[PDB]
Amino acid sequence: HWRYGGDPPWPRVSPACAGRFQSPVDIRPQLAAFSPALRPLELSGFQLPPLPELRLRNNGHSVQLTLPPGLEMKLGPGREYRALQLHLHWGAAGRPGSEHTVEGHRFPAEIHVVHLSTKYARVDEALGRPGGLAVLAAFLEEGPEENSAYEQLLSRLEEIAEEGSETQVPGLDISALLPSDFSRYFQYEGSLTTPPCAQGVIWTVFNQTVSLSAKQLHTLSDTLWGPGDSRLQLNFRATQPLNGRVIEASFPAGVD
Ligand SMILES: [Zn+2]
């Protein structure tokens, strides 16, 4: 069972993790290719009613929320997706833990919403195929006040503190966990960021962050336990070389 960090490498057990087009990456906005074909993201069905409830589980590597059928996400013509699940990556006290970085800057945490192309019917069919999976990624930053949407999930972490434990949470507005600016993002082709590291994943990284209180960020990083009896912390993969890939930007960066 793979773990975050070390020692031992990931490719010893999962060779595809040594592929050339892996995620996450460092984003350098002044060097991204401006692409006016990248239009605002379109989501539908993300505002869920309270019932039915959704599964929330500590899998030892993250906390993962299973999404119900019917959430649709469109990256552009020919690029339509159904949402499957979301999960988080974080650091520890006084240490950030986002997966993507911007000019080498690491943010406190990161949310990933994983989607399946409408071209397939099962995740296993889509693994490794160009565009088969798409992930929406947003950075979580510290703001002054409590984020009410995130509190619906963060208040439930204590009951799933032990690795492998699960609970049920009321339906909520999944789009309220994401930034409000759907027009400004970066996009590139990469991989799953855990084994088996399958390539072909379309990554979309919002430029705008979401704000959580200091207490909420502490709740996220300090509540859960992983394998053995190590704290579930620093659960992010190191950034990977672009190897000639171009990151596109849906907007002009771009001055400083
Ligand atoms: Zn992830």
Residue numbers in the entry: 140 to 395
Authors' description from the paper:
One of the isoforms, CA IX, has limited expression in healthy tissues but is upregulated in aggressive tumours, with its expression being controlled by hypoxia. CA IXSV contains only the catalytic domain of CA IX, with the intracellular, transmembrane and PG domains removed. In addition to truncating the full-length protein, six surface mutations (C174S, L180S, M360S, A210K, A258K and F259Y) were also introduced.
We obtained crystals in space group P21 with two apparently different unit cells labelled ‘small’ (unit-cell parameters a = 44.5, b = 65.4, c = 46.7 Å, β = 115.1°) and ‘big’ (unit-cell parameters a = 48.9, b = 65.1, c = 76.3 Å, β = 92.86°). Data from H/H crystals were initially collected on the FIP-BM30 beamline at the ESRF and they were shown to belong to a different space group to the previously reported P212121. The overall active-site arrangement of solvent and amino-acid residues appears to be largely unaffected, with an r.m.s.d. variation for all atoms when superimposing all four structures onto each other of less than 1 Å. We conducted a careful OMIT map analysis of the structures and found that in all four structures there are one of two ions bound to the zinc ion that come from the crystallization conditions: either acetate or formate.
